[model samples]
Target chain A: DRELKNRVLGMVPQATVSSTQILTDWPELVKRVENHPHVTGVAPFTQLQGMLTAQGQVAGIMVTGIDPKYEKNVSIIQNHIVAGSLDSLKKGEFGIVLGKDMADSLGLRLNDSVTLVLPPRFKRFKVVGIFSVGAEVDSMVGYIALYDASTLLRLPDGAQGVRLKLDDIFAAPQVADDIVKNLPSNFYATNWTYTNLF
Target chain B: DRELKNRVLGMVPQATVSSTQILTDWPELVKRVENHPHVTGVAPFTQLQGMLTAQGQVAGIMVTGIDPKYEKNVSIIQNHIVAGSLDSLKKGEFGIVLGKDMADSLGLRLNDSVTLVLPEATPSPAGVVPRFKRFKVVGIFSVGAEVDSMVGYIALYDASTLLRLPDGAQGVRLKLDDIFAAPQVADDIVKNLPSNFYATNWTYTNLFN
Candidate 1:
C-alpha cells in the first residue's frame, strides 16, 4: 500500500478529450470513480505542446502556441502578462514579450526578428515588446503569442491544451510526485514541474 | 467545426473521478492540440448529470468521493463542517449534511436519514470504506455551482478510507479575476507562487467577454 501511495498514474495526455469521450460512453466510469466510497478523488489533465521562443539577441524566452480564445479559467496566462498584453497576441501573429532575462536567451529586441522554430522552417517574429512577472516562472515559462508557439512547434496556429488539476494527485500515480504536489488543487495545472526544464 | 464545438462530446458524472481521468489524459492531448495550427485554445470543466443539478446550484458543481490522506487537498468536509470539526468524522463514520436547497425543500433535520439516489449502485467493498456513506440530514450548503447535478462533497477520511487510498489527495488551485488581464495575472501569479507550482491560464476573453 505504501508503495502504491508513492506511485502515481504518471502524466495523462489529452484528458479533456478522453474525459469528454468517457463522459459520453463511460459516464459510469466517472460516476464509479466519484461515488466509489473508497477512492479519494478523480481528476483529469491535457498535455501541452509549445515552442519556447528565445530572441537571438536576449536571453528572454517565451512559451508560445496557446489558444487564447479558449483559455478562460486558466490563471497562468491571465495573471502573468508582464510587459505587453495578451490581447496584443490575438492577431495570432504579433507576439507578447517576456522579461529581460527571457529576452536575453532568445536574442530578441523591439522589432528584431525572433525566430519561432517550426519543425524545420522558422516563423520569424519581431520583438513587439517585453514583459516581466518578477517571479520564478519568469525564468521558465514566458508569454509568447499563443499563435506564435503554434507556428514554431508546427502545431495549429490556435492550438490549445485542456489540462486537469486533481484535488487528489494520487488518483494518477504515474504522475510525478513533485508535479502532483505543485499543480493547483482544482485547475488546469501544467506539467512544467516534472518535465524537462529547458 | 460548428457542430463539434457546440455538440457535447462527453460528460463525466462527477468531478473527482473525471478530474483524475482528465488529468491523466492531458499530456497526450497537449501534444496533438499543440501540433494543429488551426486550433487556438481548449477548455475544461465538470459536467452536471443534467440541467437539474446545473440549475439547482448557483455555481458549477463538482462531485468527489473523499480520501483521508489527501484530506487537505481533497474532500468538501474541510470546506463545510456544520455541526463539528472535520476531525470528528472518522474513517468509518458518515457525517450527515444537507444539499444547498434540498434541505429547505424537504425540511429535513440532522437526525433524519436522508436517501440520496446515486447514479449507480455501489458494490460492497470488503476492506474498502463504504462508497456511499450517508449521514443524518444535518445542514446543506450551496457553492455557486449547480448543486442538484454538478456538485457533491464529503469528508476526506470517509471518502479515502472507502477508496482504500494509502496516501492523501494532492491537488492544485488557480485563480484570476480579469479576462483582459490574463497575461499580467498569469505572469504575476507565477512570479508569486513557490517553485513547486506549475500553471497555465486560459485568457480566452474575446469579443464575447
Candidate 2:
C-alpha cells in the first residue's frame, strides 16, 4: 500500500487561480519537471469534492479526473481494478471507476449507472470497474474522463492537479522542491513528505 | 398545468424539524383529512435543498424523496418519463429520475450517475457533517410545465437517509377531487393541524419560494 501511495505525487494550485489555469500551461510545466532525474512520468489530474449516490445512499467523494490511457503508468490506480476493465474508458465512454467499498456500499456492479450530483443538475456514469487497494481508496475514490471532468468542474480548460511518478519515491520532497524552484510562482509542487506544501 | 399543479398541495414545517417528524405524524394527519369529500389521495415527501454535480459542474437542486408507489397517484411525476422507465424503480432500485431541464442541462441520460449534496447538518462526533448521495438516472421526465426546469425524484426511504430524517418526512402532499377547494382545504388543514405544521396550496409563491 505504501508503494502504491508513494508511486505518485499530487500537485495542486497554491491560490485562487483555478486548476484549469495551471493545466492550460501544462505543456511547459511537464517539460520542466520531466527533465528532473528522478521523475519518470507526469500525468494531469483534476480532483474535487462531490457527492456520489447509489441506492439512495450518499457519500462525500473525491472525483479524480484522469487521462484514461496514461493513468496506469503514473499511478497504481490501474493496477488495483478488481472488476471491469479500465481499457473501456479509452474508447471515450462516459464510464466511472469506483473503489470497491464504494461499489459494495452502493450495491453497484459493472455497467451500473453511478450518479454524479453536482449542482443545478446531475450526470450519470456507467460503472466500468471496481478497485481495491486495501485502503481509503475503496470508499473515497472516483475516476472519470479528464475533459468531461473539466467541463463538470467548470475549469475553463478543465484542469487541476498533476501526478508525478518517480524512480525513487523517497526523493519526492527533493523533486517537488526542484519543480517549485524551476516553475513560475503560479504553480506549486507537493509530495508525500510535504503534502501540505500546496 | 393549473389542474396538474392543484392536484397536489405541498406542506412544510412552520418550525424547524426533520422531514421524519412530519412523516411520523402523517398517518394521523392524513386520517384527519381523508374524510374530506375533496381529498382524493395523500402522500408523504421529504424535500431537501441540495447540490448536484456531474463531470465537475455544479448546480443548485431540490432533491424530492417520495414513496414511488404512492407518488404516482398524487403527482404528474409518473407521467413525465421522456426516456427510461419509472417502472424500473418498482423493485426499489437506487436511481434518480430527473426533470427534462435538469437532465438536458447536465447532458445526463439514463444510467448516468449524479451526485447529490445535502446541506442538512448531520451530527457526528466530529460535529455535524454535510450529507451527500449518489443516484443513477433511471428515467428523465418532462412535465411540459414550469417544474420541467427544476426537481428530481428518488425513493422516499433513500431521501430520508440523505436528509438524515430519523423520524419520517418533511411534509405531506395531497391530491384533490376539486381543484377549487385547494385554498379552503389548505386553510382549514392548517388551522386544525398541530401548532408546528403549516399548509400551502400550489401557487407560484409556494412552488418556487
Candidate 3:
C-alpha cells in the first residue's frame, strides 16, 4: 500500500505540517519549515473538499490550490499535464486542471465549462488543463492557483498546510513532530509512510 | 487493476461500490412487467478474460462483446471514435475495436492482425490448452481511461462463436435513469424474481467515477 501511494506521491515529500483549520499564519509556517536545518523544500497548499458538476452529473472531488512555481520543486503535478498548461491557473481566472478521469466522468473536455460546488460557494471554472497521474487522484482530484484558493475559500493569507521535502526522507516523522511543537495549538504533523507526511 | 481498485475504494467508504441483482432466466426476467420506471435501458453484454498479442507483446484484456447499435444506445463511447469506426464490426469478420492506449502499446495499425488467446482449462484433460485467433484491428476508441488498454471490443455473435454459448451472452447490463438508485432499483427488480437471478450495479464494475 505504501508503494502504491508513493506512485502518485511523485517525489514523496518527507513531511507535511497541517493544521486542524486553515492556518492564518501560513507565511510563518512556511518560514518555520524552511528554517529547519534538514528541510530542503517547502510548498504551500490549500485543500478544500468540493464537488464538480457538469450537466446533471455531479462527482465529489478534492481540490488543492497550489503555487505553480513552488509546486515544481516539491511535486510533479505540473509534469503530468497532458493537455493545456498548468500555468493557465492564474489568480482570479478561475481556471482549473482536473484529473483526466475527473473530466471524463463529468463529461468535460479541454476548455469546457464546469461548476465547482463548495456548498454555499459555487464558481464556474474553465477546464484549462487535464492531467493523467494514472492513479486514484485522476478520478476526483483537481488543482487551482493558490491565490484563487485563498480568495475563494475566504482565507485571505490562510492555507491548510505546508508540504516539506528534506535531504533524508527517513527523518520525516521526527522532523514533522519537531515542527508541530512550535505551531498553533490546532496544528499537527505527519509523514508519507504511516500517513503522517503524505 | 485490482491494486488500482483498492486505491479508489480507499478514498470512499464501503458505500462506494455495489453489485447488481443476479438473474438466471435472463430473457424471461427481462420481459416481466417492470415496476420501476427508472429501468430505462437494458442490454446483453458478455465479458470474458483473455490476452491479445501483437508485435510479440502480450496484454491482458477484458473483451466485452457488444451489439454496435444497441451499445451506442446506452453510452457516448460511440461518439469518441477518433479513428476508424464501430460500424466496421461485423459478425464473421472477426474485427476488433481497441482502446487507443492498447493499440499504441501493441504497435498495431489498421488492418493489422493480432492474436487473441483464450486460456481454456476445459478444452482437454491433459492440461490447460489455449485457443488462438487472428483478429483484424478494425477500430480504435479512446474512453480517456486505462480501460483503453484493459478492455477490447468485438461483435456479440463473434464472442458467442468463440465461447459457443447456448444463449448469446452471459448476463444483462442494466442502465438506470439515475444510477444512484441502483441498489433500491435492483433490489425491487429481483426481490420477486426467480432465485437464480442476481444483479450488480456500475459502482461495483466502475469505481473510477
Candidate 4:
C-alpha cells in the first residue's frame, strides 16, 4: 500500500492562461521547469470535472487529458489496466478509458459511447479502455488524449495544466508553490497531495 | 551592432567539469548559481570548433549549441533574417544558422545542407575520434560581435547529441542587472558552484565580447 501511494501521490498543476499564452509560452515554461533542482519529469495535462452521461443516467466524473509520458512520470496507471489497453491512447486516438467502478455503476463497457457535458457545449467519446486503481479512481476517473481533453475544455493547444514529478515526493507542495510563483500571472499551481478533493 | 555586442558581452562563464561528472549535471550546477543576487539570467552553452562542408567545399568554423531562449533572455541577434527562420530551430530541429560572412565564405544558403566535423567528447582506444553531423541551413545573421564570422548556431539538444554530452551544456552564459558588478557577481557564482566548477566574467573578453 505504501508503494502504491508512492506511485500515485505527486504534483498536479492547473493553469488558466489564454490560448495565446499556451501556444507561445508553454515551451518556455516547460524549459524553465526542466531546469529546477527538485524536478525530475514534467508533462502537460488537463482535467475537468463535469457530468458524464451513460445509458440515460448521469453522474459526476473527472475527465483528464494526459501526454504519453504522463503515466511513467506522474502515475503508474499501466499496472491497473484491467480491460482494453493503453496502446490506442498512445496512438492519439479519440477514446476514453473509464475507471472500473464507473464502468460497473454506469453499465458502461468497451466500445460504448459516452457523452461528457461541461455546459454550453459537450462532446462524446468512444470508451476504448478501462482501468481500476482502487478508491475514487475506479468510479470517477476517465482518460483521453491530451489534445482531445484540451479541445473539450476549450484550452489552447489542449493544455489546461502541466503535471510534474519531483525528486522528493514530500516536496510536492513546496515545488508546486515555487513553480506557481515563477509563472506568469496567467498560470497557477495545485498540490494534489494536500488537497482533499483529489 | 555595438548594442548587440554589449548585450552578448555580459556573463560568460567557461566551466570545466571532470570526465567522471555527467554532462547532464551542468543544469543543476547552474541552478545552484541562482543564489547569487546579481544574476538576472543564466543559460547553458557549449562550443565546438570544427569544419563545415557545403557543396564539396570545407572551411574551419566554430559551432555552438545554446539554449533556445538565450536570444530572448540574454542577447539579440540584431541583423534581420536573410532567409529561413530561427523559430523552428527552437523546436529541437537539427538545423544550423550561420553568420552572414561565414555562410558567404562556405557558399551555404538557406535550405542547403551542411556537414560539421568536430572531435569526439573523449578519445577512443583507436585514438582521437571525430564526430560528424549534417544540418539544414535554417537562417543567417550578422551580429558584429567579434565571433560572428567564425560561429554557427545549433539548437542545444542537437548540440548536446553531437558533442556526446548527455548531461548537456558545458558552459553557462549569464545576464547581470548591473554590468559594474561583474567581478562580485562572477565570484559569487563561482563560490556557489560545486568544487569542480569555475566561472569567468565577460569582462575577461575573448569570444563575443
Better of 1 and 3 by TM-score: 3
Question: Model 4's CAPRI class?
Answer: incorrect
DockQ (C-alpha based) per candidate is 0.02, 0.01, 0.02, 0.01
After the best TM-score superposition of candidate 3, give how far the Cα of residue B43 lies from its true spot, in angstroms: 40
Clashes of each: 132, 36, 19, 3
Index of the highest-lDDT prediction: 3
Please report, as a residue range, the 10-residue window in candidate 3 chain B with the lowest summed lDDT: B10-19
- Candidate no. 4 TM-score: 0.43
lDDT of 1 by residue, B1-209 (tens): 33221211111111111123223243343343323322223222222121112113222223333332333332233454343343443445555344555544544444555443223324665433323334554335443212332344445444344344432232222222222232343444335434543334331100000
Q: RMSD, each candidate, Å?
A: 19.1, 23.3, 19.8, 22.6
Error of 3 at A6 (Å): 6.8
Off by over 4 Å in 1: A1-49, A53-93, A101-124, A136-198, B1-88, B96-99, B102-138, B142-153, B167-209
Which lDDT value does model 3 have at B115?
89
How do the residues A32-75 of candidate 3 rate in per-residue lDDT, one tens digit apiece? 67879678888888777789999988988877788787787677
Q: After superposition, how far is residue B41 of candidate 2 from its true place, in Å?
A: 66
lDDT of 4 by residue, B1-209 (tens): 34433534421232222222335666675676545676676666666688898777887877767666554555554245567766657525678988888888778889888988886545567665767788889888875433456677788778777755563666666666654454456666666456755555432310000
Q: Which stretches of candidate 3 lie over 4 Å from their true place?
A: A1-6, A11-14, A35-38, A193-198, B1-209
Model 4 chain A: lowest-lDDT 10 consecutive positions: A10-19
Query: What is the TM-score of each predicted model, taking all chains together?
Result: 0.34, 0.43, 0.46, 0.43
> Which lDDT tens digits does candidate 2 get at residues A162-195?
6777765545545666666655565665543211
TM-score of 2: 0.43
Q: A1-198 in candidate 1: lDDT tens per residue?
A: 232212112212212212211122222333433443223333321222234454234332325333344342223344444455555554456565455555666665555566544334555556655655433344544445554444444443332323333443222222322232443343122222111000
Candidate 4 runs further than 4 Å off? A1-198, B1-31, B78-80, B90-92, B120-128, B203-209
